[PDB]
Design a binder for this molecule. Structure first.
Ligand SMILES: [Zn+2]
Ligand SMILES: [Zn+2]
Ligand SMILES: [Zn+2]
Ligand SMILES: [Zn+2]
Lengths: 286, 131
């Protein structure tokens, strides 16, 4: 019937004018009749709206010739263990002018790095989509209290994505020609990848013959991990969701079955470390 | 909380094009690999006695066309991504777009591949009177 992908999270009670609605579903009911929509003389377009559009619910099950698929099998992931980077994101929630969606706040990786982003969302307007800071708050509850100070320490996304590319490049350039993000319950990590990942056919580096792992919007060029200085996007990453391998219960309980050297520090990087560690113990140990 | 805009039949294509470096190319390739066109567009009822111009303030379909809400026919509006104009603004959102009936099964693909004549206001190859 309907999906939550691109849900309108605004608090506006009415739908959109037929010329402005992205979809038939989003047109206001007043224009709907006889199976379709009508233009109503005297009923104007809305020239000031800002409607937050949710990025929760992507489905990367495309099958398009020459485009690699992002999600890989366990067997393929094992061959690429040196490319494994655990990844976890802690979110904040849209508030005030919008409600109903999760925005990236703290991005953590198995390298130990946490990056903090300004709460940023995709706001439809009469003229475009405005990728912009939005009102947000951490979820309530003692287990989320550590996110409170991060609400004022975020970097703009144009800075955050450069730092992600640099970190991945520094970590992986002598380990692999790719990255495999190792995830646990991947939905929100996939949402967060919309902010720093692009895809397309396989490409090569501007400066050598390796496969491209990075893309620059400044020049519309591609680079491998050795030549990506200043690049802003991760290009054609791979990924796998460890939760799907048959575990029950939370990440920590399964990680702790095999490992006593990663106490839970309750931060995105620690979840990312535990996820990669669990995967490694499951596939390579005993 | 919130109000859905989309249907499941569009999840795959919209996710693919929302992540693509080149969204127009991704949509073209998606179709060439057998994917179904984006559905859930805003199709209008009208009198089919209009001017036939491509992009208009109210529905203007002639008998060879259908009228659609403009944002719903724009890949960049549908995927909530950047537009390719210099200033990043859309020429379809806020207008109605007339689509030849022979192409009305895929309005988004039609607008991606076609060009409006700035002299006569009709689509090149689908009404332009200039030659
Ligand atoms: Zn290179
Ligand atoms: Zn461990
Ligand atoms: Zn548009
Ligand atoms: Zn012409």
């Amino acid at each position: 019937n309907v999906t939550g992908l691109f849900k309108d999270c605004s608090k506006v009670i009415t739908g959109l004018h037929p010329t402005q609605a992205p979809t038939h579903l989003s047109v206001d009911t007043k224009f709907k009749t006889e199976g379709l929509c009508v233009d109503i003389p005297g009923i104007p377009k809305d020239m000031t709206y800002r409607r937050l559009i949710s990025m929760m619910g992507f489905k990367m099950n495309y099958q398009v010739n020459g485009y690699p698929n992002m999600f890989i099998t366990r067997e393929e992931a094992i061959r690429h263990v040196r490319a494994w980077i655990g990844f976890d994101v802690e979110g904040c929630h849209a508030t005030r002018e919008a409600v109903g969606t999760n925005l990236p706040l703290q991005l953590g990786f198995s390298t130990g790095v946490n990056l903090v982003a300004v709460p940023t969302g995709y706001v439809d307007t009469p003229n475009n989509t405005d990728f912009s800071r939005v009102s947000a708050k951490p979820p309530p509850g003692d287990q989320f209290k550590h996110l409170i100070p991060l609400m004022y320490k975020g970097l703009p996304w144009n800075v955050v994505r450069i730092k992600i590319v640099q970190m991945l490049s520094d970590t992986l350039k002598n380990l692999s020609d790719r990255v495999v993000f190792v995830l646990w319950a991947h939905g929100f990590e996939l949402t967060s990848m919309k902010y720093f990942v692009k895809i397309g056919p396989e490409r090569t580096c501007c400066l050598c013959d390796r496969r491209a792992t990075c893309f620059s919007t400044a020049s519309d060029t591609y680079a491998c991990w050795h030549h990506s200085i200043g690049f802003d996007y991760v290009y054609n990453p791979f990924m796998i969701d460890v939760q799907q391998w048959g575990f029950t219960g939370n990440l920590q309980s399964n990680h702790d079955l095999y490992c006593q050297v990663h106490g839970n520090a309750h931060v995105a990087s620690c979840d990312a470390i535990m996820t990669r560690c669990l995967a490694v113990h499951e596939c390579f140990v005993k | 909380a919130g109000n859905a805009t989309e249907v499941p039949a569009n999840s795959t294509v919209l996710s693919f094009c929302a992540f693509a470096v080149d969204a127009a190319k991704a949509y073209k390739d998606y179709l060439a690999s057998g994917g179904q066109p984006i559905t859930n567009c805003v199709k209008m009822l009208c009198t089919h006695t209009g001017t036939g111009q491509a992009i208009t303030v109210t529905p203007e379909a002639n008998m060879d066309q259908e009228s659609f809400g403009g944002a719903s026919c724009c890949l960049y509006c549908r995927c909530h991504i950047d537009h390719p104009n210099p200033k990043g603004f859309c020429d379809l959102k806020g207008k109605y777009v007339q689509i030849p009936t022979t192409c009305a099964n895929d309005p988004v693909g039609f607008t991606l591949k076609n060009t409006v004549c700035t002299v006569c206001g009709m689509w090149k190859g689908y009404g332009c009177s200039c030659d």
